């Protein structure tokens, strides 16, 4: 097993919704592009990209409160995007995407794996429902 750590949620504000799994936030007083941990558009099914983007745009734009939760590993990727779990009024966007079959679990690195089993639980249930990306 990996080490484990207690993560915490930090304040941020929405600057702009980008797509399913990218969002631009004001974090510690500066704009920052964030990439959501542990999710991607399926390699072999991209039909739901627009719906995924619309979904997270609405969720992020309607939220009263956005929070960023970094994991225990790398805080930025090779492009200098933040890597985080993003919360909208306490709801984890990453988890919502997966439960709704709008993106799949992906980019699972041992370093930033704290909510892996949570998201896999959500995925297994979307897959059981043959929902959206899982429909064929
Ligand atoms: C989610 C995530 C993506 N990435 C990188 C892998 C991919 O690199 P490459 O660009 O070299 O393929 C890229 C995919 O991001 P996008 O899916 O936003 O394009 O982000 C990480 O390095 N760590 C992560 O945790
Ligand atoms: Ca994307």
From Swiss-Prot:
Subcellular location per the Swiss-Prot or TrEMBL entry: Secreted
Disordered: region residues: 115-136
Residues annotated for Ca(2+) binding in this entry: 21, 40-41
Active site: 35, 43, 81
Biased composition, class Basic and acidic residues, residue ranges: 115-131
Domain of life: Bacteria
Entry protein name: Nuclease A
The species this protein was found in: Staphylococcus aureus
Range covered out of full length: 83 to 224 of 231
